[PDB]
Amino acid sequence: IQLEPLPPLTPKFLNILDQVCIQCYKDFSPTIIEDQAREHIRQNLESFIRQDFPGTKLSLFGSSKNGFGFKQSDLDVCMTINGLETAEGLDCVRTIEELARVLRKHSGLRNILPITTAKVPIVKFFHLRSGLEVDISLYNTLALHNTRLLSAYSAIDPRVKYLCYTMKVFTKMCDIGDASRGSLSSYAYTLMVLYFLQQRNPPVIPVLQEIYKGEKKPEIFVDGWNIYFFDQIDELPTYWSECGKNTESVGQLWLGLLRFYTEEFDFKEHVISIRRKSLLTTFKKQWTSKYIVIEDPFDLNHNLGAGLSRKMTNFIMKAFINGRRVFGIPVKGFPKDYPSKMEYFFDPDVLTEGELAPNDRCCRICGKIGHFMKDCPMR
Ligand SMILES: O=c1ccn([C@@H]2O[C@H](COP(=O)(O)O[C@H]3[C@@H](O)[C@H](n4ccc(=O)[nH]c4=O)O[C@@H]3CO)[C@@H](O)[C@H]2O)c(=O)[nH]1
Ligand SMILES: O=c1ccn([C@@H]2O[C@H](COP(=O)(O)NP(=O)(O)OP(=O)(O)O)[C@@H](O)[C@H]2O)c(=O)[nH]1
Ligand SMILES: [Mg+2]
Ligand SMILES: [Zn+2]
């Protein structure tokens, strides 16, 4: 597939692109009050569950803590039991079902649903007063660490946040950010942003998992994987020589990302991997089955794109190509004929050409993957 050449931009248009990326953050990030409410929910659930399971500990992870949350993002909760370091004596499937029974007694919750067949078994439910979806998992230790990792990256430079928010808006508007419906997890798209910023010349962020006081990388193992990374961001100028050398604006970088993954990045040859600056090949990983290949920074056996079908991969790539056109090619009558720039750049009828995301892997009743119709909740 060949792509349209991009016309040269004016500074006036470049400033518009900058503003759109920043509005994605300002418009959709939670207020300080909404963040505190999320902590209050965790606190309330921990006390309620402790009535039946004393020593329960609930810990927030995901976008509530990694610096990239939206107002209506779900509440990702990790449950552990004090004194029990790992889930090696804990019966996780039976624990999920016991936990669900406890949560059905909570008058402020609705629609308790345990999902024990997923790779990560969860019990999810609806919190009435906040209107948020909550997902509780058991001993999700690695998720807690990649939450800290992403949070560290978000603190290095404000542009990290702006781009991750813009990416999250983009994929959400294209309806390609729901792994439960066959597309990619929003966490996978966050990794794509970070990988782009690491490979940029000059880089906007370093590879924190490769920064350390010499000579060798410290070895801190969790569930068989080294979770070390440099998290002393205040001292980063000392340990990152290229700190602050990239002076591109946010809009420049956002258009650069769209061009990077449509023109430059070789999906069939390389793996999107934020744990190392050196390119990682699909052949070295023996991950040639799929086109989009995304390696988790800690669980190196996890390919985030392992679930994508061929159709979904084409749909995703067409979205990025159309995004390249909308953000890169100024149009006549813009911006004076449009009372909202957000509605122009993120128009789904343009980015996906009016088509809906494919859903062939999905249940015909609810639209989720991973269950037969006799097991559907909406039956
Ligand atoms: O690697 C992971 C993946 C998921 N999660 C947690 O599960 C929650 C739901 O994950 P999601 O990627 O949106 O959907 C899962 C499952 O919840 C979904 N699924 C699977 C079987 C089914 O019957 N219904 C259903 O919706 O299909 C996917 C299987 O990877 C997330 O919010 C996380 O809190 C994690 O903590 N780590
Ligand atoms: O494939 C995966 C998916 C999810 N996770 C971990 O589970 C967290 C929640 O998974 P998530 O689907 O809620 N994505 P999130 O980062 O919270 O953004 P948002 O759409 O605003 O909710 C993620 O942030 C990861 O830490 C993984 O480790 N591997
Ligand atoms: Mg979440
Ligand atoms: Zn269903």
Side-chain angles (χ1 to χ4, degrees):
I1 308 170
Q2 317 180 42
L3 300 182
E4 308 175 38
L6 294 179
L9 298 184
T10 61
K12 173 177 270 54
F13 185 77
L14 293 169
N15 191 251
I16 285 171
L17 293 177
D18 295 337
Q19 291 166 184
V20 172
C21 293
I22 295 170
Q23 284 298 325
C24 287
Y25 169 72
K26 295 199 295 181
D27 279 12
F28 304 118
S29 60
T31 66
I32 58 175
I33 300 294
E34 284 164 349
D35 282 332
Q36 195 200 42
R38 288 172 179 263
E39 169 53 22
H40 286 343
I41 292 170
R42 184 210 64 78
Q43 194 170 352
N44 174 276
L45 295 172
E46 189 181 63
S47 298
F48 180 87
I49 294 169
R50 272 177 179 171
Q51 297 178 5
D52 298 88
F53 298 145
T56 288
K57 180 181 173 179
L58 301 185
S59 306
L60 292 182
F61 69 104
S63 72
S64 295
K65 290 297 203 179
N66 68 17
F68 309 127
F70 281 21
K71 295 177 180 289
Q72 297 299 316
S73 291
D74 66 357
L75 194 72
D76 303 289
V77 181
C78 169
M79 171 170 174
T80 57
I81 300 177
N82 293 342
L84 206 62
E85 186 185 359
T86 70
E88 176 191 9
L90 184 66
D91 190 338
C92 291
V93 289
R94 190 169 171 179
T95 300
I96 287 287
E97 291 168 357
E98 292 177 4
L99 178 59
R101 287 173 192 121
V102 171
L103 293 168
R104 289 177 183 114
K105 303 181 301 195
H106 195 306
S107 62
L109 312 181
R110 296 294 188 281
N111 306 319
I112 312 307
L113 183 61
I115 305 180
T116 55
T117 62
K119 284 169 183 289
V120 179
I122 52 170
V123 48
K124 55 160 58 188
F125 53 89
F126 182 69
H127 188 261
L128 252 182
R129 291 187 179 270
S130 78
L132 295 177
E133 188 71 14
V134 188
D135 297 49
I136 302 182
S137 52
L138 288 174
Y139 283 84
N140 202 344
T141 319
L142 292 180
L144 284 163
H145 284 97
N146 73 46
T147 297
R148 290 177 47 252
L149 178 68
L150 268 55
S151 184
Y153 280 116
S154 81
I156 294 174
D157 191 307
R159 297 176 290 173
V160 181
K161 279 189 172 184
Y162 299 146
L163 283 168
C164 288
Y165 273 80
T166 303
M167 177 66 107
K168 198 169 259 176
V169 172
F170 182 82
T171 56
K172 192 173 297 297
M173 294 301 300
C174 295
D175 205 30
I176 58 173
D178 192 344
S180 72
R181 298 187 197 268
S183 54
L184 289 174
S185 171
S186 64
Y187 170 68
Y189 290 118
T190 302
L191 297 175
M192 294 185 65
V193 177
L194 300 175
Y195 180 74
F196 163 75
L197 298 173
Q198 287 171 334
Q199 296 293 315
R200 195 64 164 176
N201 185 31
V204 177
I205 51 172
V207 180
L208 295 172
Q209 288 165 269
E210 289 183 336
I211 290 178
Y212 49 80
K213 295 91 174 191
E215 59 181 343
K216 63 174 291 184
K217 181 181 183 176
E219 294 177 328
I220 317 299
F221 285 104
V222 176
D223 293 339
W225 302 106
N226 186 3
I227 56 82
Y228 165 81
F229 67 91
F230 187 84
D231 65 347
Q232 294 177 336
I233 304 302
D234 56 329
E235 304 180 12
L236 189 63
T238 305
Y239 301 99
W240 187 30
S241 58
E242 298 194 290
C243 188
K245 278 168 64 178
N246 185 293
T247 58
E248 303 181 60
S249 67
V250 193
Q252 185 164 359
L253 290 168
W254 170 243
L255 180 56
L257 180 150
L258 297 170
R259 298 183 64 193
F260 173 71
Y261 284 121
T262 60
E263 305 173 19
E264 189 177 351
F265 184 72
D266 190 341
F267 284 101
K268 191 175 181 183
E269 196 67 85
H270 293 137
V271 180
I272 294 164
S273 169
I274 64 164
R275 70 178 170 91
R276 46 183 278 165
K277 194 177 195 320
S278 173
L279 268 42
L280 180 58
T281 67
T282 191
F283 174 83
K284 184 183 172 176
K285 276 290 189 161
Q286 299 182 254
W287 283 353
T288 50
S289 301
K290 303 297 182 176
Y291 190 75
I292 300 173
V293 190
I294 302 170
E295 180 197 58
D296 183 87
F298 295 137
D299 186 348
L300 307 187
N301 289 339
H302 185 15
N303 172 23
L304 281 278
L308 298 182
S309 71
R310 295 171 298 267
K311 289 183 67 171
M312 184 63 75
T313 304
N314 289 338
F315 189 85
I316 292 168
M317 292 305 304
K318 285 172 182 292
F320 278 86
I321 293 169
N322 290 335
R324 172 184 177 274
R325 190 180 55 257
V326 179
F327 288 91
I329 299 188
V331 178
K332 176 175 174 176
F334 189 87
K336 309 317 192 307
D337 294 340
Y338 311 81
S340 173
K341 296 160 181 167
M342 294 286 286
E343 289 175 16
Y344 167 84
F345 286 109
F346 295 102
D347 187 349
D349 295 331
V350 179
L351 296 176
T352 61
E353 304 181 20
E355 298 295 331
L356 294 175
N359 68 343
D360 303 340
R361 300 172 52 203
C362 297
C363 171
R364 67 184 65 180
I365 301 173
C366 66
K368 300 298 194 70
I369 62 97
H371 70 251
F372 294 110
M373 261 172 284
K374 295 187 174 183
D375 318 314
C376 186
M378 298 293 95
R379 177 178 181 269

